[PDB]
Amino acid sequence: NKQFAVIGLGRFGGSICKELHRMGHEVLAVDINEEKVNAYASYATHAVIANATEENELLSLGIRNFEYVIVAIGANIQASTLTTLLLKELDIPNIWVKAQNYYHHKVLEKIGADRIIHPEKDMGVKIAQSLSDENVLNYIDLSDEYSIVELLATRKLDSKSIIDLNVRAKYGCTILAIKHHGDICLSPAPEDIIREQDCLVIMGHKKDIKRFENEGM
Amino acid sequence: NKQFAVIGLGRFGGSICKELHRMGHEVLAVDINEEKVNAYASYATHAVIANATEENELLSLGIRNFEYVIVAIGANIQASTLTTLLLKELDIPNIWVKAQNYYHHKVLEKIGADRIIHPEKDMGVKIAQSLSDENVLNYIDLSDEYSIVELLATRKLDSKSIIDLNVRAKYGCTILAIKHHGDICLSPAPEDIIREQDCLVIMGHKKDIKRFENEGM
Amino acid sequence: NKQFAVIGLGRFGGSICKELHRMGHEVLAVDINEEKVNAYASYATHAVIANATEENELLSLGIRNFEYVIVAIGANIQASTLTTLLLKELDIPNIWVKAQNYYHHKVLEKIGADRIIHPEKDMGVKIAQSLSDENVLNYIDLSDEYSIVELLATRKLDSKSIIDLNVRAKYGCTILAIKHHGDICLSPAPEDIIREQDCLVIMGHKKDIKRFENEGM
Amino acid sequence: NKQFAVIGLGRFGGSICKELHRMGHEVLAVDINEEKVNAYASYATHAVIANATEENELLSLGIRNFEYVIVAIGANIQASTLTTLLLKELDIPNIWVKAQNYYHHKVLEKIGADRIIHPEKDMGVKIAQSLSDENVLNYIDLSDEYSIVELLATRKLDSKSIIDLNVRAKYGCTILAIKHHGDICLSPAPEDIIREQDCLVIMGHKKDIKRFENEGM
Amino acid sequence: NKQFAVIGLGRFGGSICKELHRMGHEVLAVDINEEKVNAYASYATHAVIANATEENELLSLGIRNFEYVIVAIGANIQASTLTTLLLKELDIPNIWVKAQNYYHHKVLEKIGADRIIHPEKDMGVKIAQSLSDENVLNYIDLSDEYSIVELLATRKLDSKSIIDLNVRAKYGCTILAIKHHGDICLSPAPEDIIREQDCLVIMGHKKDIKRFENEGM
Amino acid sequence: NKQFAVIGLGRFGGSICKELHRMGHEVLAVDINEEKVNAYASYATHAVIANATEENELLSLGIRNFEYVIVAIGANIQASTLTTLLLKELDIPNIWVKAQNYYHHKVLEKIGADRIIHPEKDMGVKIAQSLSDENVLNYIDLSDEYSIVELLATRKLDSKSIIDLNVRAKYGCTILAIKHHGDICLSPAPEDIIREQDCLVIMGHKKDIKRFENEGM
Amino acid sequence: NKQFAVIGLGRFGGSICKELHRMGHEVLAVDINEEKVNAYASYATHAVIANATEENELLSLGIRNFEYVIVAIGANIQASTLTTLLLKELDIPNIWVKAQNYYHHKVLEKIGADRIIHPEKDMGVKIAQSLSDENVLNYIDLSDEYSIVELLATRKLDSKSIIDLNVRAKYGCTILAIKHHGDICLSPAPEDIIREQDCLVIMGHKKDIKRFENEGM
Amino acid sequence: NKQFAVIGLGRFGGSICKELHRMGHEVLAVDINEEKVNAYASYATHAVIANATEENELLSLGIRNFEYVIVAIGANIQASTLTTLLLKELDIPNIWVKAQNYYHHKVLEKIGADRIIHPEKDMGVKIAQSLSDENVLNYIDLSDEYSIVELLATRKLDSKSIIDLNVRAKYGCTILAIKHHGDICLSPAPEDIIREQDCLVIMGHKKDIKRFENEGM
């Protein structure tokens, strides 16, 4: 009975609730707009019209029952701030809030929100990376310098071996996976071929990988 | 270098432009809202007030020249749609568009957008995984079943060795990295220690990692 | 049981439904504005308030029953586009859509509308023809060059014969009908008189007719 | 040549002005919306921003000089009405006005408009005929009962001769034209062939043509 | 059973109905605004919310029963015009309409309104007369030259006689009434005194009276 | 001559200014609406854009100089009230204000307006008298009971003599004027004829005139 | 049964009613906005939605029962004025009204409001005093010159005696109270210590106190 | 001298600025509304149009220099909040903010405002005391129980001596001042007379003063 309540059904909030529901958790959907509540009614355990800045409505939902509450209101700063503050004063263990700008972040930080999230901003960065470097499909940064990257293989690697493309010595990186025709190879061994348009998961330093990307592929 | 046009300086569009500019690419920042143009003036090569649905304004920007055009308008479907169409007829190589819902996705597809992105939806899914599992700090899905996961170490893992935690045989998963106090250990050998509250990077099957999480940590 | 549904009750949509009803077909009238639905309630088999961009409402009407659906929404491009797309995905055989401008035409074309109609634009042309040439009551173009025209006869034709006004040799046109005092003569024979203010239906080349209009009448 | 003023650059008004200009007549394009004036600047002799209900602006345009004035305002009854009245008192020869509904028609009639047009309504009727009868591509009504119709030929008509299809005796109707692959056959002789998917132009009584359609094609 | 219906409850319309009711006539109060209908509910025989431009509502009131209908809508020209036209077509014997400007007068005149009234304009004149000439309390014009005026008497007439102030010979006017301390004297005889601040009713030529006003009072 | 300020160029205010200007008095026309200032520019000595509630603007107009100030604002109570107060504190001799309702009258009274006018209300009463009695063209009430009335002559009065119609004895009323075909007969002698459709001017008691109307005409 | 009614529930009005209720008086809460009425429903004897400018609603509340009525509407001048006037005419003994500016004060004064209050303006002054003089916690003016002030004691008074800080001779002021650690001493005697950060209540001339504030503390 | 910035020229903010300026301190008057800047131009050292939430505008005002900044925005929570935060990060010594409700208070507290004021609420309490007790003209609370009160003398107190009214023993309270006809008697001796309608200033316990009021006056 770990209960989640998602306040604000926007694209971000909507997705969290829709997803949490798919996982088979208990989720309460909360939105001031009636139509939204109708929309996500299928995708939550309970859907309720509520003005989340209004304390008595908030109490009527039985919000003190929830371990996690998500304020997925990032356009209306005042609604967002007021709801978060209410939840803090109502002693909610985890208050996760969508933030709009650096300033909205600060107030939320100050009023005691447990996690502040910038979904647009973060993906903006991620896509910009993929934009400049048309080779990066996906990735994850380990630290400021070290990073795991998923790469779409060019024709300058078609049918080449792991040992052929020596990266652990030649480029200081390690290869972790190949994905060919949907089939997946993990921690692939020294003799393994890589074909054009496969998925390649290289791990190392950011600059090291980009080096490899230059002369390698 | 590479020429990029970012039409619509939202929170998502704005990040792309800000980030790409930090990478030092030629970025044209376009918005109909004057104050947005004024806001991102420091973070672009050229920031211009334009109505991106108005064709003559689009030629006045000289958009035909650009390799990549990003429509970061995702609230106003009509603006988004109408612009993408304009850019298509104008023979732009790569048109990447921010989408709002499944149907706005569909029209973009049908008018031939090159890449459609749902930043909020995708991020929603990500955070939702992090919500039901407090241990996962981050992750990347290699495929429907296989995934590389970043985990926050608990007390059950303090002073534990890689050989002690036999993931490679017991769980079919492999550890890739350990982050201790900001210091970073890549593709670490079996003698190495994991201290609590550190970043642990495991790789394997989804159901297999969850298995490790349960009995392991 | 060929069923027609007319979505959007404007002047154009309204007329289609009002007319189709007069013919004794089955017609469903659909408009988001309640008053419109009340208006055309007499002139349809069934009149229903619906927001046609909303799929569940659209399904509740039982729209999959209709062989022909007409989206007579030309001011609101976004409502028009979204409805058409919905209907395409719901596998409607014939989707006829009112278009507003060249661009709205294109998107509709791309999303797979079966016939795009520009009722204002077309009549604008037709009347402009009648405007310059005060003699043309009505007409129909056969091709870019050839055209059937209905003409109001001047005093320079009063009581003249078919043979007198020889057009098949002298002007390369053929006369098809005279309409005098409401009485109608078809394929009128060589001796037939034509009186002032009668209706004359000439068939030929566009330039040929205008020639006739100059020296003839 | 002839002087025309088109007040109200709608989709209907706009077409008149665009078309008349292609014919090379002197067309004054008037609208209260600046952006409309800007849009049709290429398609007129003089395009002016004016409030057509304001009398002094109407003298500043010098409208008394024009032979033909077209009020293409059909949404805003008050603007339409008030303007027509202004033009009447200003002794304009021909005032043609776009009408919205039967009552807006009535006032225009009563304030002495010279020609009232319902472009959407009329076109609605036309398309509706085409809807119930997929064969009719176009048509012109000579009177309440007699009409010239353009038909799309089916398989039942392929390789058929004009003498084979005796319309002149069997159905009281006469064929006027055949269009094959863009090529055009006018007032064709009895030996001529009709191939499927061609344009066929028949003339007669309405009920008679429908009769031919039924058993013939 | 002479029935009156007052459509439009403004200051002017409201007063007509309120007054007609006081006289003990049958009056129907009609206004689109519900509150107005509530207001005049006491002051009419029947008060009904109706949109007077809507024919079926108009028919539901049973408007064809009324000998006199008053359209007391002078701000909204379009509502006024449309209602009047409706009433004309519904064959109402007397249609009295409040007009706003010279143009609104003309259309009403043309569509066949039986009496057009300019309540503001008329009183504006009347008060302006009283303004310049602080002596004129009230008056009524007989023709362009001849006029009956009510006058407040100065100290230069206090205790003077009818014969003393000879106006029928000296000024070509005739005196008709004196009103002293509320008591009224009619066709007052040659010996009658007039005191300061009495009411004096002089009849004659406009210029004649003003002459009297100069040297007399 | 005399200085007048007309604040608020309504239909009522506008008439005062237009009329007073025709009389050739110095009239200052003030309105907050620019287009009103532009409209009455021809009909005043000085027409100025001003917010009459703003004190400094009121000194910039130099209103202290004027003998008469007319507040012809009767829809906007707050504007009306606030202005009148401003003018009072500014020691203006005569403040005449247009009032909307009984309570707006009351405040004006209490803030010391010199004359309060209800043009619509008063005119409403007048026309209402004319409605129930088609014979009364015009009138003036001398007091609660005594009144001078202008009557439209019927068939019952055609070719009738003043001596024949003994009003002075039979009805206690006196005839004052006869208007025949525009020609005017003042204080007419007993031999004089009244022809039908002429203006008749009777004087007496209200109930007495109605009495004459009934049996007389 | 001294009844109070608070019309207008703003911050000021709300506080009056909330407070009067705490005291255990009978209070009627009145606001046009429904939500406000719901808000103060707990904090009044009776809470009622009413438009206070509407007389019949006002009468339905039974407003003639109240000894005191408070019009706590200071933003909307017209609503405030109209309500006050209504209450005057309904013969309410005490009409206390919140005023917005000097002008709104005047009209209220003129229409006979019993007390006019400027809550913002007054506190603005009070705080500005505390602002310049960081030593003044609170105070009360006796007249234009004489004033009782509460003062926060500096380190230049820590552990000093009443006789030590002789003010009745040295500065012409008298000390009335010390407040130390919450404990209160009144009319404190000559030997009494004063510690840093205590509360000191000095009484005298305004200039006298400020003198003391300079060399004393 | 001391530098003060008053952001938001409300009725409360406006008074602070007007008063502080009368005291002759350097006051910067900031508002987003141009007309407010224009209004208080006479009552400040520098009056500037600025959006106080916009950071660059805040540096353009040079706000870092000021010792005291007052946020007198209390309707617009978001503006208020966002500004206070800006000023905090900009290291301003004293930030005094006007608050609207308990929750707007809370955020200000949490973002570290130095003093939060509720001018309406506080004043509401004050007047409410004056309402239930017509005798109290003014007062100051020394603590929860002890208070100095200004009283309006009744008939029961006329010609009464300080010794006659033994408050110091009978009621535990002490009289501090008597105001007679504007003349002022400070810390008055026992022989002194109180005449009716004078200001009386008593000091003691709250319940004790009420006791005196009951039996005394």
Ligand SMILES: Nc1ncnc2c1ncn2[C@@H]1O[C@H](COP(=O)(O)OP(=O)(O)OP(=O)(O)O)[C@@H](O)[C@H]1O
């Ligand atoms: N006080 C409130 N109580 C409950 N729901 C609210 C409240 N205020 C806003 N919402 C809802 O929460 C959602 C928040 O999304 P919003 O419109 O603020 O933009 P956004 O967060 O940038 O959108 P997205 O989540 O797609 O990025 C909306 O559906 C809105 O109706």
Ligand SMILES: Nc1ncnc2c1ncn2[C@@H]1O[C@H](COP(=O)(O)OP(=O)(O)OP(=O)(O)O)[C@@H](O)[C@H]1O
């Ligand atoms: N026709 C247009 N031409 C240029 N810019 C436009 C046009 N229409 C919208 N924009 C801009 O594009 C941006 C798109 O953001 P929008 O407000 O539409 O919602 P959103 O994309 O969901 O927001 P976010 O990116 O923050 O999630 C806005 O900054 C807007 O000013």
Ligand SMILES: Nc1ncnc2c1ncn2[C@@H]1O[C@H](COP(=O)(O)OP(=O)(O)OP(=O)(O)O)[C@@H](O)[C@H]1O
């Ligand atoms: N989503 C919707 N669902 C159903 N009906 C709609 C929807 N959107 C608009 N309509 C209706 O369809 C009609 C469409 O006409 P619209 O106002 O778009 O201008 P128009 O098509 O140019 O007018 P006309 O048909 O006279 O040329 C309107 O009556 C409108 O109320």
Ligand SMILES: Nc1ncnc2c1ncn2[C@@H]1O[C@H](COP(=O)(O)OP(=O)(O)OP(=O)(O)O)[C@@H](O)[C@H]1O
């Ligand atoms: N007083 C006026 N003076 C000049 N132009 C005007 C005036 N009023 C309206 N217009 C213009 O006339 C045009 C009339 O089109 P409108 O938007 O009224 O509906 P419509 O005529 O039904 O549209 P459509 O012609 O596309 O069917 C508009 O472009 C409008 O800007």
Ligand SMILES: Nc1ncnc2c1ncn2[C@@H]1O[C@H](COP(=O)(O)OP(=O)(O)OP(=O)(O)O)[C@@H](O)[C@H]1O
């Ligand atoms: N279509 C309609 N049907 C019925 N009543 C209407 C309609 N349109 C307007 N009214 C009402 O009739 C009244 C007409 O007054 P309006 O607001 O037009 O200004 P006005 O005539 O200048 O005012 P006044 O009569 O005081 O001079 C209003 O009360 C309005 O609510």
Ligand SMILES: Nc1ncnc2c1ncn2[C@@H]1O[C@H](COP(=O)(O)OP(=O)(O)OP(=O)(O)O)[C@@H](O)[C@H]1O
């Ligand atoms: N503060 C102001 N200063 C100057 N002029 C104003 C102000 N407020 C209103 N006006 C003008 O005064 C006129 C008053 O007419 P309003 O529209 O208020 O209704 P009304 O007096 O009932 O109309 P009417 O006189 O036609 O019956 C308007 O022309 C308006 O522009």
Ligand SMILES: Nc1ncnc2c1ncn2[C@@H]1O[C@H](COP(=O)(O)OP(=O)(O)OP(=O)(O)O)[C@@H](O)[C@H]1O
């Ligand atoms: N006619 C009316 N009848 C009853 N209540 C009203 C009326 N008009 C306004 N109110 C209410 O009274 C209150 C008055 O506050 P208002 O919004 O006028 O600003 P304010 O008085 O400056 O606010 P505050 O009292 O906080 O200083 C509001 O809650 C409003 O809803």
Ligand SMILES: Nc1ncnc2c1ncn2[C@@H]1O[C@H](COP(=O)(O)OP(=O)(O)OP(=O)(O)O)[C@@H](O)[C@H]1O
């Ligand atoms: N971002 C901003 N920058 C500068 N000034 C602002 C800003 N936002 C609001 N203001 C101004 O601050 C003032 C604050 O008053 P507001 O109207 O918000 O209500 P209030 O403070 O309750 O009013 P009052 O002080 O009269 O009780 C207004 O004059 C407003 O124009």
